[PDB]
Ligand binder design. Structure first.
Ligand code: L9E
Length: 171
């Protein structure tokens, strides 16, 4: 009944084919592509919050060497579990289902300096994950959804010149 589908999945797959990269900065940088999902099967009458976090994908970091990503060493200690609350939260099921849910404003940083940003470790791979939480639920039920097409490596600068070009092209 509940269905959460990735929007613009073909576009994410073009980046994933190259190995996607997302820039992190001291002040925080918005993602491109933007993560957007369509939702059906919630109770239109109920209220829900939408949350976003980033799950580390490997037990090692990465390095771009001779035009290829390769295992690049031991990981750094895990980033703190930062969660991003979608600014429309809390809202009716009808609100979330009437048009795609877009996380256009989240910013990724390599420095914990508030502002509701997500701290990531450079040269580590992450996968976005969305959680739906129902308001007023004594069971505190939450549903979690992963998006394999949206995996990316966090970078202080683009390594792959094809990614640099792709980002300029489709944006
Ligand atoms: C009265 N009634 C019982 C079923 C009657 N047919 C409901 O409230 C209801 C009705 C229709 C659809 C859903 N949708 C469910 C689907 C999962 N979910 C949910 C998702 C994320 C977090 C917490 C969650 F509880 C919902 O709220 C609920």
């Amino acid at each position: 009944e509940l269905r959460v589908g990735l929007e613009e999945s073909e576009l994410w797959l073009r980046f994933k084919e190259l190995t996607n990269e997302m820039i992190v900065t001291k002040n925080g940088r918005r993602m491109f592509p933007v993560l957007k999902v369509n939702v059906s099967g919630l109770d239109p009458n109920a209220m829900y919050s939408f949350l976003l976090d980033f799950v580390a994908a490997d037990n090692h970091r990465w390095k771009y060497v001779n035009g290829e990503w390769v295992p690049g060493g031991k990981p750094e200690p895990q980033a703190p579990s930062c969660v991003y609350i979608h600014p429309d939260s809390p809202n009716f099921g009808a609100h979330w289902m009437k048009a795609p849910v877009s996380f256009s404003k989240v910013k990724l940083t390599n420095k914990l300096n508030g502002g509701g940003q997500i701290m990531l470790n450079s040269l580590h791979k992450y996968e976005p994950r969305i959680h739906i939480v129902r308001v007023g639920d004594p069971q505190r039920m939450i549903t979690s959804h992963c998006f394999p097409e949206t995996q990316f490596i966090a970078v202080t600068a683009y390594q792959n010149e094809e990614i640099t070009a792709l980002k300029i092209k489709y944006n």
